[PDB]
From Swiss-Prot, chain A:
It comes from the Viruses. The record marks 87-88 as: Cleavage. The lineage of its organism: Viruses, Riboviria, Orthornavirae, Pisuviricota, Pisoniviricetes. Residues 166-216 are annotated as: Heptad repeat 1. Changing residue 55 to V: In strain: Isolate GD03. Residues 195-239 form a coiled coil. Changing residue 44 to V: In strain: Isolate SZ3. Glycans are attached at residue 73. This is Spike protein S2. Mediates fusion of the virion and cellular membranes by acting as a class I viral fusion protein. Under the current model, the protein has at least three conformational states: pre-fusion native state, pre-hairpin intermediate state, and post-fusion hairpin state. During viral and target cell membrane fusion, the coiled coil regions (heptad repeats) assume a trimer-of-hairpins structure, positioning the fusion peptide in close proximity to the C-terminal region of the ectodomain.
From Swiss-Prot, chain C:
Attaches the virion to the cell membrane by interacting with host receptor, initiating the infection. Binding to human ACE2 and CLEC4M/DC-SIGNR receptors and internalization of the virus into the endosomes of the host cell induces conformational changes in the S glycoprotein. Proteolysis by cathepsin CTSL may unmask the fusion peptide of S2 and activate membrane fusion within endosomes. Changing residue 145 to S: In strain: Isolate Shanghai LY. Disulfide bonds join 98-119. This is Spike protein S1. Glycans are attached at residues 35, 43, 79, 88-89, 118, 179, 209. Residues 1-213 form the BetaCoV S1-NTD domain. It comes from the Viruses.
UniProtKB/Swiss-Prot annotation, chain F:
It comes from Severe acute respiratory syndrome coronavirus. Acts as a viral fusion peptide which is unmasked following S2 cleavage occurring upon virus endocytosis. Changing residue 46 to G: In strain: Isolate Shanghai LY. This is Spike protein S2'. The chain holds residues 954 to 1050 of 1255 of the full protein.
Length: 314, 189, 213, 49, 49, 97, 49
């Protein structure tokens, strides 16, 4: 639900402390200004992409004193205050697997990992005890088992089934969580989707930097090696040729970033929908909140993304 | 001339010229190496032609500068943010004017506070929290408030939301005994 | 005798310091597993022919008695034009570029040339005083210069050239300004090898120490 | 009227957006850098004339 | 030069002097030499003729 | 180029040389057109996404009663009405709370 | 739910049967290679769709 908030200093990139270059850059008008706004626009979108997904609850709730609800463990989903950290056990696992003369940098997000974690914690706490109106209005405290009974009714299972088999259900639930922990802990394919976004970002920046060494038919890729041995006539011709090349490399980069940003937006939009329908309530549509008949789900914080745990009846 | 270290200088070595900051280093140079490069094709360090000392070259601090303002129809005021800069260098180069651009009428007062975003000067830092109006970064936002009858730009930690709590039981339940009808709006292009 | 180059003939292409990185480039390197020509000095048989340079060669020698003393690089290989003699003179390394009247079969006496005229370059190094030692060299022509790399390792081989990998370090860049198309080895059992360099693309692995591993 | 784009940070923004009126918020108006001081020149010892 | 007859000007100025033949070549923009540097310098711009 | 104005090149400058100046100016300008249209296509794609959503909401919020939470408003959806707007659609979402 | 998996040899397209062209193409480094990869990365998702 995000990508790096990159930023490029147009003048630094094109004209490596060259006065003659700068003069030959001004002649191209608003070139740098246009690029700057485009990148700024993206950075702004990256911020919204996060807020629109996580900030679903107007009230922050305190972590329940006891995490044990009707036999349901929950301990690996919620933060544990005993430790100095503010994340859940699962989240810690998730977060363990995912100047320069080039004028390139990156800006920080508004919401830090701790702030995001706080939101997820509130949502989980809500889910566990706030009932069905958690995201609709005032929270309404309800016994967990009763909440589950309702969910089963929605599935198409007669209420009594839950209660009669409550012990087995709670046990299976707790087991499934432990199973996931092991799967996550010992895998390498897990948040491959998030790593992919990161890898592609790096490639774009790497490519852009490499282009600075491009010759473009010039005597030399280095401005200093143009000025130092040439009379002003040819020197300007050579610089202009080098500038042309570099100007293109920037427009190319930004174009790709704009396209990339659009795809991230689409992902972020879906994430917001899933949280709304899968977490703050009980979706009925098929094959949307997991691979079975949806009961409930829990969000977890992740490095530039969102991880959902979908609990289904099969 | 003598080496001038730990500051931005204009250097000229026998084969390498440019500007930047010279610092000593422990790079394991071979008997047949004069200078080195970074992973990317930029000069990393140079061995001195006279004393055979190895010094690294760091870039002179640069970056984007942004201004934080309320509306001009409300008041005339501004705070200035220097992206990713240690405020120690920002202050130094204002007193020792070595900044581009420099303003005709400008000075640096006590309103200096550093955040992960960069060095923010002109805003008053507070130890409270509010709804984020103008986002800065890393949990920090700016807003314009009355501070013990004059309003000013302040720097604060944004609130995540309302602070509340509910009880849990295994034998009680909350049920609405009233309701209301409300109308909200939505706009799309 | 033809042998395999293994992974030998690698050298530091430039005086640039790097660390912990993979660097891809192209230069006159000895191709891996190339066809290497062996030469021998055994009993009555001594190989000391004139060998084509082809803009750069690989040289190695296995010694226990320092039979190989040097090389002669040039064109016509006589006093008609310039050639350079590079020898271990037993106390100093001596390099001279002149129009030399060379011995057709060169070797307590220095029998390399009878006369030298029109000398353009002279250099003398500081003084000094199974096979055991493997000496490795690379010779390249560039912008009138003869670029020379050197290396060395302990050995324990009788006739062959042991497989392995070793990066050589530069030693000379001689501003000779001469035409080198051919060369001859200068001899005092022992053996040596000659390969040819090619403009081949290599990926070089630089360790933390900045060395090539 | 006129705006001196070097007088203060406010002027820079006004010039940047080509307007005497600004509504609200945070804006990047330019880059910045520190200016180098003296010179450092170095050469090899021996001079063979 | 042909098209000078198609243009109007607010003024015409003319500079006059005597130089050595070989130095005539220095009377142009982007030139260096005794004349170009110390006697008669032209700006980086077009010159009429 | 000597001038951004085509006429100030073509009119006074010698027709041979003029082609050089003109060709350069043409290339310069063509680049801005390519940039402009590229951005417009991207912007258009974003509008499509919005339009698609609006169409969906019209059907599910106005012409029927949506049950999916927060789609037609925060509360429990009862009713909605569309309104005309300058290049957009404005909805009134009536909910039970 | 798909489009043709376009693939073009950027070397042949630009410098078809010309060494001199290629020699000059090299002055643009890996541009040709990067462009090729970028295209392949699109065809790759057609299978996914
Ligand atoms: C919800 O589900 C979770 C997951 O199962 C439960 O959490 C577990 O609770 C148990 C209760 O103590 C933890 O017990 C672990 O025991 C390990 C073994 O050593 C003890 O037992 C042996 C038995 O003979 C004794 O000999 C020995 O002296 C000890 O008494 C410990 O090694 C574990 O220590 C952990 O924390 C320390 C903290 O610094 C670490 O250094 C250790 O490496 C290790 O992490 C621990 O004591 C068990 O670990 C808990 N699991 C998790 C994942 O936390 C919940 O209790 C359950 N909730 C409810 C209400 O049932
Ligand atoms: C319907 O499916 C459920 C689970 O999918 C079945 O419940 C499981 O029944 C087996 C034995 O029939 C239980 O195994 C036993 O567990 C006890 C625990 O201490 C152990 O001591 C025994 O040796 C044995 O392992 C299993 O635990 C139980 N699963 C759960 C979650 O309780 C259920 O029996 C199925 N229905 C029918 C009619 O079989
Ligand atoms: C270039 O020539 C100069 C000659 O002045 C060499 O510089 C001199 O180097 C020495 C050794 O580092 C410097 O320190 C001196 O050490 C002796 C040791 O006993 C000590 O007695 C002296 O008081 C002093 O400490 C010496 O100051 C230095 N001179 C200057 C002016 O810097 C320089 O090393 C030569 N360069 C090369 C590459 O040889
Ligand atoms: C902005 O710059 C100032 C000045 O350099 C930074 O303050 C200095 O921070 C270092 C820690 O990195 C402090 O400890 C020093 O550590 C080195 C490590 O070898 C040690 O050799 C020194 O003796 C010292 O212990 C240093 O005391 C501190 N300077 C002062 C005057 O407090 C400051 O942290 C920088 N701000 C940011 C955000 O980086
Ligand atoms: C349903 O019952 C719960 C539990 O009693 C009510 O929540 C609790 O209500 C009390 C009184 O309004 C809250 O204030 C408490 O007052 C005592 C007075 O001495 C004070 O000692 C406590 O420290 C506290 O101030 C209490 O905070 C509140 N607890 C929670 C978690 O909200 C709840 O309001 C009842 N709901 C209805 C509709 O009656
Ligand atoms: C809801 O969960 C709470 C969890 O604290 C239950 O409260 C606890 O209920 C037990 C049984 O009524 C109380 O008595 C305890 O009995 C055991 C029997 O061996 C004894 O060892 C304990 O010392 C204690 O006497 C216990 O005091 C009580 N805890 C508190 C804090 O009140 C509550 O009953 C549950 N409600 C329902 C409807 O299940
Ligand atoms: C849910 O809460 C609302 C709160 O507005 C209740 O509606 C209000 O009910 C009162 C009593 O029936 C209505 O009459 C009021 O009586 C007082 C008596 O002195 C008078 O001063 C007021 O001016 C007014 O007449 C009041 O109008 C009504 N609110 C509105 C907007 O009509 C509602 O009945 C509650 N629902 C349930 C099921 O309890
Ligand atoms: C390189 O140096 C050798 C010196 O050995 C030159 O070869 C020699 O050239 C002379 C002249 O043609 C040959 O004839 C000699 O003439 C003198 C005249 O008085 C006579 O006294 C000698 O007895 C002899 O006849 C001489 O035989 C010949 N040397 C040999 C071994 O054939 C050679 O020409 C020089 N190369 C160049 C390119 O200058
Ligand atoms: C093999 O190497 C030895 C040692 O370098 C050569 O013998 C040496 O030849 C030089 C003349 O070139 C003799 O005189 C020296 O001249 C330098 C000039 O600056 C002077 O500094 C020295 O003190 C000395 O006067 C030198 O004495 C002589 N040394 C010996 C041991 O003979 C020899 O000629 C070389 N052989 C060949 C074939 O080149
Ligand atoms: C290339 O980098 C390696 C780094 O591993 C350098 O090798 C290491 O050099 C140290 C210093 O001689 C060796 O001794 C060590 O001393 C410390 C002192 O407290 C001691 O704690 C260590 O146990 C060890 O004795 C160290 O063994 C050595 N490492 C290896 C693998 O040889 C190496 O010198 C660098 N190369 C060059 C040319 O500098
Ligand atoms: C020494 O070398 C020089 C050149 O480095 C020789 O002079 C050249 O001789 C050729 C013979 O045809 C002429 O074509 C060149 O024009 C000559 N160059 C110059 C600068 O004169 C010289 O003859 C050589 N001397 C000896 C004894 O061989
Ligand atoms: C904007 O200008 C009008 C002009 O009268 C003024 O009344 C209004 O209060 C101004 N807005 C603010 C926020 O001050
Ligand atoms: C020696 O040269 C001959 C020439 O044909 C060749 O056949 C033979 O194999 C060579 N010796 C070795 C060991 O290769
Ligand atoms: C390399 O030497 C072997 C020795 O038998 C020979 O067969 C082979 O053809 C040679 N390769 C080339 C390219 O000459
Ligand atoms: C070296 O000699 C060969 C012999 O034909 C000649 O063709 C070549 O051009 C010469 N090279 C130089 C640099 O003189």
């Amino acid at each position: 639900v995000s990508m790096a908030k990159t930023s490029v200093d147009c003048n630094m990139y094109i004209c490596g402390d060259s006065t003659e270059c700068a003069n030959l850059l001004l002649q191209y008008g608003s070139f740098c200004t246009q690029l700057n706004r485009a990148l700024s626009g993206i950075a702004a979108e990256q911020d919204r992409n996060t807020r629109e997904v996580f900030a679903q609850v107007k009230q922050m709730y305190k972590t329940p004193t006891l995490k044990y609800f009707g036999g349901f463990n929950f301990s690996q989903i919620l933060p544990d205050p005993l430790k100095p950290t503010k994340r859940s056990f699962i989240e810690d696992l998730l977060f363990n697997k995912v100047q320069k003369f080039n004028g390139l940098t990156v800006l920080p997000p508004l919401l830090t990992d701790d702030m995001i974690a706080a939101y997820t914690a509130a949502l989980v706490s809500g889910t566990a005890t706030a009932g069905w109106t958690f995201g609709a209005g005032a929270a309404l405290q309800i016994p967990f088992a009763m909440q589950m009974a309702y969910r089963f009714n929605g599935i198409g299972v007669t209420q009594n089934v839950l209660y009669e088999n409550q012990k087995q259900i709670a046990n299976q639930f707790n087991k499934a969580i432990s199973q996931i922990q092991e799967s996550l802990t010992t895998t390498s394919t897990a948040l491959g989707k998030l790593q992919d976004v990161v890898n592609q970002n790096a490639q774009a920046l790497n490519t852009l930097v490499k282009q600075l060494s491009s010759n473009f038919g010039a005597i030399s890729s280095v401005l200093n090696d143009i000025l130092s041995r040439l009379d002003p006539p040819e020197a300007e011709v050579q610089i202009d040729r080098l500038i042309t090349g570099r100007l293109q490399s920037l427009q190319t980069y930004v174009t790709q970033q704009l396209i990339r940003a659009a795809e991230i937006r689409a992902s972020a939009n879906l994430a917001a929908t899933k949280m709304s329908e899968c977490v703050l309530g009980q979706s009925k549509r098929v094959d949307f909140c997991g691979k079975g008949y949806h009961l409930m789900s829990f969000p977890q914080a992740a490095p530039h993304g969102v991880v959902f745990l979908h609990v289904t009846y099969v | 001339t003598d080496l001038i270290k730990n500051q931005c200088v204009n250097f000229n070595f026998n084969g390498l010229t440019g500007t930047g900051v010279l610092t000593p280093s422990s790079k394991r140079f071979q008997p047949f190496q004069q200078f080195g490069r970074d992973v990317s094709d930029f000069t990393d360090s140079v061995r001195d032609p006279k004393t055979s000392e190895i010094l690294d070259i760091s870039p002179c601090s640069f970056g984007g500068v942004s201004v934080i303002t309320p509306g001009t129809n409300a008041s005339s005021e501004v705070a200035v943010l220097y992206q990713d800069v240690n405020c120690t260098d920002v202050s130094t180069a204002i007193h020792a004017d070595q900044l581009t651009p420099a303003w005709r009428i400008y000075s640096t007062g006590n309103n200096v506070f550093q955040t992960q975003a960069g060095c923010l000067i002109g805003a008053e830092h507070v130890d409270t929290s509010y709804e984020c109006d103008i986002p800065i970064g890393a949990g920090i936002c700016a807003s314009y408030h009355t501070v013990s009858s004059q309003k000013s730009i302040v720097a604060y930690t944004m609130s995540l939301g309302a602070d509340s709590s509910i009880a849990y039981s295994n034998n009680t339940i909350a049920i609405p005994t009233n309701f209301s009808i409300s109308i909200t709006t939505e706009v799309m292009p | 005798t033809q042998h395999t180059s293994s992974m030998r003939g690698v050298y530091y292409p430039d005086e640039i310091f790097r660390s912990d990185t993979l660097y891809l480039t192209q230069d006159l390197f000895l191709p891996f597993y190339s066809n290497v020509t062996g030469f021998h000095t055994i009993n009555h048989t001594f190989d000391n022919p004139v060998i084509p340079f082809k803009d750069g060669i690989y040289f190695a020698a296995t010694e226990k008695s320092n039979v190989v003393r040097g090389w002669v690089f040039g064109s016509t290989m006589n006093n008609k034009s310039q050639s350079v003699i590079i020898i271990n003179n037993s106390t100093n390394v001596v390099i001279r570029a002149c129009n030399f009247e060379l011995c057709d079969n060169p070797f307590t006496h220095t029998m390399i040339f009878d006369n030298a005229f029109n000398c353009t370059f002279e250099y003398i190094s500081d003084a000094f005083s199974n096979f055991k030692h493997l000496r490795e060299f690379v010779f390249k022509n560039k912008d009138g210069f003869l670029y020379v790399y050197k290396g060395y390792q302990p050995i324990d081989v009788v006739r062959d050239l042991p497989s392995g990998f070793n990066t050589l370090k530069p030693i000379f860049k001689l501003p000779l300004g001469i035409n080198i198309t051919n060369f001859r080895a200068i001899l005092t059992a022992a053996a040596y090898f000659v390969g040819y360099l090619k403009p081949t693309t290599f990926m070089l692995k630089y360790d933390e120490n900045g060395t090539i591993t | 009227d006129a705006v001196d784009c070097s007088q203060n940070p406010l002027a820079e923004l006004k010039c940047s957006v080509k307007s005497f009126e600004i509504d609200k918020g945070i804006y990047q108006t330019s880059n910045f850098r520190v200016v180098p001081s003296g010179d450092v020149v170095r050469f090899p010892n021996i001079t063979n004339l | 030069a042909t098209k000078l007859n198609d243009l109007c000007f607010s003024n015409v100025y003319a500079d006059s002097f005597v130089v050595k033949g070989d130095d005539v070549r220095q009377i142009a923009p982007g030139q260096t030499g005794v004349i170009a540097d110390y006697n008669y310098k032209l700006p980086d711009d077009f010159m009429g003729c």
